[PDB]
Structure formats: structure tokens, C-alpha cells
Amino acid sequence: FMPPREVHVQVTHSMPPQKIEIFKSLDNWAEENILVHLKPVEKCWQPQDFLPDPASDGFDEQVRELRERAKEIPDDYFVVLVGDMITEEALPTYQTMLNTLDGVRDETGASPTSWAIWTRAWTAEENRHGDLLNKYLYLSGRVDMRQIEKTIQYLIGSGMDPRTENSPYLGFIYTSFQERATFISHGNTARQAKEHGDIKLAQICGTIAADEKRHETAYTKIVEKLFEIDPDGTVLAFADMMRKKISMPAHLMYDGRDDNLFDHFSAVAQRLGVYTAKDYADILEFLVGRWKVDKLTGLSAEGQKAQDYVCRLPPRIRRLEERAQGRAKEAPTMPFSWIFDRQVKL
Amino acid sequence: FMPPREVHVQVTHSMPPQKIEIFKSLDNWAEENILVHLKPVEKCWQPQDFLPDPASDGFDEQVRELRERAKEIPDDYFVVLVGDMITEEALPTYQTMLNTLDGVRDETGASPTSWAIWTRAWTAEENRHGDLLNKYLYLSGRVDMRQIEKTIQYLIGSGMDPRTENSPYLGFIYTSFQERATFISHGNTARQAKEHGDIKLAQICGTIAADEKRHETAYTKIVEKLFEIDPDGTVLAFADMMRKKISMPAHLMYDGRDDNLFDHFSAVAQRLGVYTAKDYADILEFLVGRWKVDKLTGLSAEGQKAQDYVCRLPPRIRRLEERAQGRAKEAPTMPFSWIFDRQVKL
Ligand SMILES: [Fe+2]
Ligand SMILES: [Fe+2]
Numbered sequence: 089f090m091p092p093r094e095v096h097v098q099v100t101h102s103m104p105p106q107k108i109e110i111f112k113s114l115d116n117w118a119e120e121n122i123l124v125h126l127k128p129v130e131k132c133w134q135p136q137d138f139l140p141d142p143a144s145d146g147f148d149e150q151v152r153e154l155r156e157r158a159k160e161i162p163d164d165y166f167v168v169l170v171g172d173m174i175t176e177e178a179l180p181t182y183q184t185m186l187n188t189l190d191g192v193r194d195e196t197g198a199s200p201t202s203w204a205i206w207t208r209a210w211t212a213e214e215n216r217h218g219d220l221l222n223k224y225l226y227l228s229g230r231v232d233m234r235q236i237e238k239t240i241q242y243l244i245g246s247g248m249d250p251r252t253e254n255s256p257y258l259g260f261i262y263t264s265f266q267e268r269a270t271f272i273s274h275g276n277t278a279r280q281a282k283e284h285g286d287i288k289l290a291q292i293c294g295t296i297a298a299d300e301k302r303h304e305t306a307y308t309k310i311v312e313k314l315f316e317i318d319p320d321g322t323v324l325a326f327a328d329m330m331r332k333k334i335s336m337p338a339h340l341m342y343d344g345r346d347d348n349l350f351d352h353f354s355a356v357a358q359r360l361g362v363y364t365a366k367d368y369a370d371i372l373e374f375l376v377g378r379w380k381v382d383k384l385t386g387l388s389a390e391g392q393k394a395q396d397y398v399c400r401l402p403p404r405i406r407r408l409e410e411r412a413q414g415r416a417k418e419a420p421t422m423p424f425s426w427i428f429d430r431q432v433k434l
Numbered sequence: 435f436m437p438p439r440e441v442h443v444q445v446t447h448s449m450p451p452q453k454i455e456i457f458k459s460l461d462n463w464a465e466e467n468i469l470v471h472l473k474p475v476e477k478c479w480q481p482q483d484f485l486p487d488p489a490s491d492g493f494d495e496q497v498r499e500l501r502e503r504a505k506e507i508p509d510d511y512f513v514v515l516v517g518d519m520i521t522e523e524a525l526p527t528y529q530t531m532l533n534t535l536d537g538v539r540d541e542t543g544a545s546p547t548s549w550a551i552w553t554r555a556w557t558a559e560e561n562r563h564g565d566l567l568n569k570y571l572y573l574s575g576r577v578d579m580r581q582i583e584k585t586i587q588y589l590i591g592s593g594m595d596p597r598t599e600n601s602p603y604l605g606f607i608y609t610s611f612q613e614r615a616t617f618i619s620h621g622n623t624a625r626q627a628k629e630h631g632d633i634k635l636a637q638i639c640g641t642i643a644a645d646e647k648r649h650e651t652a653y654t655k656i657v658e659k660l661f662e663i664d665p666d667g668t669v670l671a672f673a674d675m676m677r678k679k680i681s682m683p684a685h686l687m688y689d690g691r692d693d694n695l696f697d698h699f700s701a702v703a704q705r706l707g708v709y710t711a712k713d714y715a716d717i718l719e720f721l722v723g724r725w726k727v728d729k730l731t732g733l734s735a736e737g738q739k740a741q742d743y744v745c746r747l748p749p750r751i752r753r754l755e756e757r758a759q760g761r762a763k764e765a766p767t768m769p770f771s772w773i774f775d776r777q778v779k780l
Contacts, residue, residue, distance in 0.1 A: 089474060089475070089476050093544075094544045098541075098542050098544075098545065098546070100541045100542060101541075128435060129435070129584060129587050129588050129591065129690070130435050130584075130690055132584075132587065134579075134580045134583035134584055134587070135579075135583055136579040136580040136583055137580070139572075139579075142501075142572055142573060142574065142575035142579065143575045143576075143577075143578065143579075143774070147575065151497075177561075179526055180525055180526045180529045180530075180557050180561065181543060181554075183526045183529070183530055184526075184529055184530060184533055184540065184543055185543045187530055187533060187534075188533075188540070188541065188542060188543060194530065194534070194593070195444075195446045195447075195534065195600070196444050196446060196534060196595040196600075197527060197530055197531045197534060197593045197594050197595050197596065198439075198440045198444070198592065198593040198594055198595035198686075199444065199595075200444070208527075208590060208591050208592070208593045209591050211526050211590055211591075212586075212587045212588075212589075212590035212591040213587070215523075215526065215586065215587065215590055216583065216587070219568070219583070222565070222569075223568075223569065223572060226485075226488055226569060227488060228488065229488035229489045229493065230489075231489075232489070233480075233481075233482040233485075233488065233489075234480050234482040234483070237480035237481055237482055237562065237565070238475060238476075238478075238480055240558075240561065241475050241478065241480070241558045241559070241561065241562065242475050242558075243558075244554060244557055244558035244561055245475065245554050245555045245557075245558040246544065246554070247540070247543045247544035247554050248543050248544055249542040249543050249544035249545075250543065254541070254542075340544075344475070344476055428489070
């Protein structure tokens with residue numbers, strides 16, 4: 089019953105150590121540019137805002153309406169939603185990931201540094217996503233919670249190596265790409281929940297999307313400054329990540345039944361138009377756009393090629409991955425333990 | 435609206451670096467002595483096992499029975515249960531904490547080392563506790579979930595510095611003490627749920643207790659080997675931790691309303707006999723017993739005093755903290771946002 093393992097040689101601490109200082113120097117910069125994308129907790133929504141109120145006489149009719157509505161939502165959607173939700177619940181991993189990063193790590197668990205304050209805050213904000221989606225899914229009755237729980241335990245046990253090699257350059261680029269992927273993801277699960285008549289679920293997805301967009305803005309701003317301070321190392325970092333392809337935090341997903349669970353979940357996501365290969369491209373083009381990569385000049389021999397590769401990658405990735413031919417018609421149907429081994433097209 | 439902050443100078447990397455090797459050496463030892471307390475995921479219980487089944491015709495009558503029973507459980511209990519639950523949900527922090535530890539850290543997020551495998555697995559096991567208690571509490575309708583959620587967000591944002599200084603010696607002693615504290619905690623919330631007629635909740639707490647006992651056994655076994663390999667550094671570490679007093683992972687608890695929320699939650703917990711100053715002693719006595727600290731001989735000048743301090747501490751802590759006089763009668767009554775500002779004795 090072994091889950092899938094990371095298949096690539098594991099590289100640690102691949103950024104010149106003499107560069108930690110730049111992040112220690114950037115500390116106050118971060119305090120005034122990042123710790124603003126922090127809504128005070130009192131201002132933040134909480135999951136309870138979107139769920140039946142267990143301390144109200146309303147509770148029953150609310151739970152009943154929730155379920156009544158969930159019937160008009162297809163299984164394929166739920167598979168995607170569930171996958172989405174599982175990714176979210178693997179958060180401990182993700183915090184841990186951010187804390188592998190060399191100049192921006194929380195050395196104690198309660199470090200007073202801007203980098204740490206941000207990490208602990210982002211995590212606290214992120215924690216509400218799992219909770220919300222979880223309970224929603226629980227209440228819905230449309231899904232197999234035990235299999236979903238099992239999946240999550242496998243996932244956290246497995247972890248992820250996003251191949252950031254302990255580099256804040258790579259780490260912050262990764263998360264930049266990452267968070268945008270899930271803004272689109274939820275953006276669409278939201279759009280689609282409305283289309284299937286469930287405004288309250290659309291609201292759940294939409295709010296989660298808003299949160300991921302705010303975080304996107306923050307991590308890009310860190311990278312923007314890195315591009316500004318150290319163009320060379322940064323372009324190099326961006327090209328490195330793209331060469332490796334960004335791998336989603338949930339790729340080692342496993343439910344004890346399906347050895348290609350991630351591939352399969354992603355396929356459904358793609359068929360429904362929730363998150364496509366097309367989007368993956370749109371992300372780094374946006375990112376090449378945002379970081380004005382084309383507008384950079386004066387770099388090292390190695391910088392030249394890195395820039396050009398990263399600038400010219402989206403059109404190629406576009407063609408390469410727009411031949412949905414074998415799979416945008418004769419995709420097989422496949423069971424999913426998350427929905428009691430009911431089946432959906434791939 | 436600022437939460438409480440850690441009040442002690444933050445010390446990092448206080449273990450001689452030349453000692454990382456001992457943990458790298460201990461790697462295979464850990465694989466055959468620790469990765470056994472790993473029940474395969476398939477064998478593990480999941481939260482759904484203890485909750486109403488949302489995909490059953492039974493769901494309603496189950497939710498109904500759950501709440502009917504929660505009425506016969508007093509508010510003070512719930513305060514304790516909720517605080518217990520919040521501590522649990524601060525898990526991201528705790529994984530992060532274990533990963534601050536120098537020779538036992540996960541360098542990548544999916545490190546193939548025994549130490550990392552254990553950390554990721556322990557975390558995946560621990561994740562179920564929050565989920566379970568959360569949903570239970572949500573269904574119960576006896577508690578204010580929004581205030582609980584808000585508390586959690588503050589908590590994760592705040593984190594904890596358990597003062598382990600990046601030392602696996604200190605880290606593993608901390609978690610050794612820690613996990614035993616919550617085995618007792620849950621042991622008693624369990625006993626007491628039965629006493630108030632809610633067997634299903636007793637089962638929830640009892641199962642969570644079983645998990646923590648398994649983990650206790652593992653972390654003590656790491657420390658046992660450390661005592662065995664390096665008696666000096668270890669006794670020194672144990673005395674250091676005790677001098678500092680072990681601080682619970684949730685001490686910086688805050689709900690936007692009560693500036694001494696931890697103290698207040700702990701007080702209720704003490705009044706109900708869930709976790710007392712008396713217990714805190716019983717833990718390190720058990721630990722001084724378990725690690726046969728008294729039976730050690732041949733140490734350094736500094737080792738002598740460290741051993742004796744640690745051996746003779748529990749009786750003193752016992753007398754010192756058994757004068758529940760000012761507080762084991764005329765404790766004030768106090769509101770708790772976790773229960774809609776209803777009040778309980780302290
Ligand atoms: Fe998220
Ligand atoms: Fe626990």
C-alpha cells in the first residue's frame with residue numbers, strides 16, 4: 089500500500105550563503121511592503137460565516153438546504169472540489185516548505201522577523217480554507233469523507249519537494265506561481281457552483297479565491313524586489329523553476345486505491361475547465377509580464393539565455409499542450425474513492 | 435487588538451554543531467526503533483469513524499442524538515474541550531517546531547531521512563485530532579465556532595517558541611513532556627464525557643489519547659538513546675528544560691477579548707481535574723523514572739548538579755503547587771467568548 093514518491097534527486101541549500109544577508113537587509117522593506125496584505129484577524133472572515141449556524145434554530149433547515157443544493161452539483165465537480173480541498177488541508181507541509189527557505193526561515197517557531205511574521209500569518213489565513221471546504225464537504229453528503237481523510241493522511245505523510253532547494257528566490261517564485269494557480273482553480277469552481285445553482289458554495293470558493301489573490305500580490309512583490317536587487321540570480325532562478333516545471337503541492341496524492349490519483353484528478357479539472365494546461369501557461373506569461381522580464385537588460389552570459397528561455401516558453405507550452413485530442417474526446421471513465429467509487433469522465 | 439507575545443530572549447542553535455553527526459548516525463537506529471510506532475494509514479482510524487455519517491439515512495438522527503447529548507455536558511467542560519481542541523488545531527506550528535531541530539530537520543519537505551519520515555507521519559496522524567474535535571464541536575451547537583476559529587487564527591499567527599533552541603535533545607524532551615501532558619488531558623476529558631453520559635465523545639477523547647500515548651513512547655525512545663549515547667549533554671538538556679518550565683504550545687492563545695485566555699482556560703482545566711499542576715509533576719517524575727536518571731553515574735561536574743536538580747524537582751513542585759487555597763475555593767466566575775460569553779468558575 090505504498091504511496092508515490094518524489095522521483096528527482098533531492099538538492100539542498102543551492103543558493104550562495106553570502107546571499108542570506110540580502111534577505112536580512114530586506115527585513116524592514118518586508119515589514120512595510122508585505123505586512124500590509126495582512127488584514128487584522130478581527131477583520132477576517134471565518135469559516136462559520138459560510139456554514140449553517142449550529143447555535144441557531146436555523147441549523148436544520150440550513151443543513152437541509154445545503155444538501156438539497158449539493159444534489160444539483162455533478163460528481164465530476166465534486167472530485168475537483170475534493171482534490172482542491174485536499175491540497176488545502178496539506179497546509180502543514182506548505183508552511184514547513186516556506187520554513188525550509190534559508191534567509192526567510194522562522195528559526196524558533198515565534199521569530200520576531202518580518203519573514204517569519206508573514207509566514208505564520210499567511211499560514212493562519214490559509215488554515216481557514218481547509219476548515220471551510222472540509223465542513224462544507226462533510227455536510228454535503230455527496231462525498232466519501234473517510235476516503236478523503238485517508239487521502240489527506242497519506243498526503244501529509246508523503247509531503248512534497250517542490251525543488252526549491254532552500255532558496256527564497258526559488259521558494260518565492262514557486263509560491264508566486266502556485267497561489268495564482270489556485271486563484272484560477274477556485275475562481276472557476278466558484279463560477280461553476282453558481283452555474284449549478286449553489287450561490288453559497290460559489291461564495292465559499294470566491295472568498296477562498298480572494299484570499300489566494302491577496303497572497304499572490306505579496307509573494308510577487310518579494311520577487312519583484314529580488315529582480316530589482318539581484319536581477320542575475322533571479323532570472324536564473326525563474327528559468328530554473330520553469331525548466332523543472334512547477335509541480336503542484338498535492339502531486340503525491342494517494343487514496344490506497346489509485347496509483348495515479350493526481351493525474352486523474354487533474355484530468356477531470358482540465359475537462360471541466362477548472363485548471364488547464366492553458367492556464368499554467370497564462371500564469372508564467374502573466375509572471376513574465378508582471379516581473380517585466382522582457383524589459384531587463386545588462387545581465388551575465390548565463391542571464392541572457394535564462395531570460396530568453398523564460399520569455400519564449402509560454403507560446404511553446406501553449407502549442408505543445410493544446411493538442412487535447414487523445415484526451416478531449418475519448419477519455420475513459422474512472423471510479424474515485426472520494427465519491428464512493430462512482431465514476432466520471434477524464 | 436494585539437495578542438500576547440513571547441517574553442523571553444530568543445536563542446537559536448545552542449547545541450554544539452559537531453553533534454549533528456550523532457543524529458545522522460542514529461538514522462538507521464530510528465528507522466528500526468521509531469518507524470514501527472507507525473500504524474500504516476490503512477489501519478488508522480479517521481475522524482469520520484466517530485462522526486454522524488453524512489451519506490447515511492442515519493445522519494439526521496445521529497446529529498440529533500449528538501446535540502441532545504451535548505446538552506447534558508456542562509459549559510466548563512466545553513471550555514476545556516475547546517481549549518484542548520484549539521491547541522490541536524495549531525498543528526502547523528508544531529510541525530514547524532520539530533523542523534527547527536538541527537540534526538533531525540526535514541531539509542526539503544519530502545526528505546527521505548528517518549527523522550523526516552517520522553515528522554511527516556506524526557503530523558499526518560496528528561492532523562486527525564483537530565478535524566475530529568472541530569467537527570464534533572461544530573455539530574454540538576454548544577460553542578461559538580466563529581470565536582473559536584478566530585482564536586485559532588490568532589494562535590497560528592502567534593506561534594510558540596518552546597525554547598528548544600534548535601536542539602533535538604531539548605526538542606525531543608519537550609515533545610516527550612508535551613505529549614504526556616495531553617495524554618492525561620484527553621484521558622480525563624474522556625473519563626468525564628462518560629460521566630456526563632456521552633460515550634461517543636468519550637470515545638473521541640479516548641482515541642485521541644491512545645494516539646498521543648503511542649507518540650509519547652516514540653519520543654521517549656529517542657531521548658532514551660540520547661541518554662545512552664550522550665549522558666552528559668542530555669541530563670544537561672533535561673535540567674535546562676525543567677529550569678525554564680515546559681510551556682504549552684497554546685500559551686499565546688487569544689480571542690480578541692481576554693488578555694489572559696491561556697491562564698483562564700488552564701484554571702478551568704485545573705478545577706475540573708483535567709490537567710493540574712499535580713499532573714505536571716507526575717510527568718517529569720515518570721520521565722525521571724523512565725529515563726532512569728537516578729541510575730546514571732560517571733558524569734561531568736555540570737552533570738552532577740543537573741541530575742540532582744531534575745531528580746529532586748517533583749517533590750518541590752508538588753508542595754509549591756498543591757496550595758490551591760486562594761483558587762480552589764474563591765475563584766471568580768468569568769465569561770468565555772468560546773461559549774458566547776456565558777460564564778464558568780475558574
Ligand atoms: Fe489556499
Ligand atoms: Fe494531539
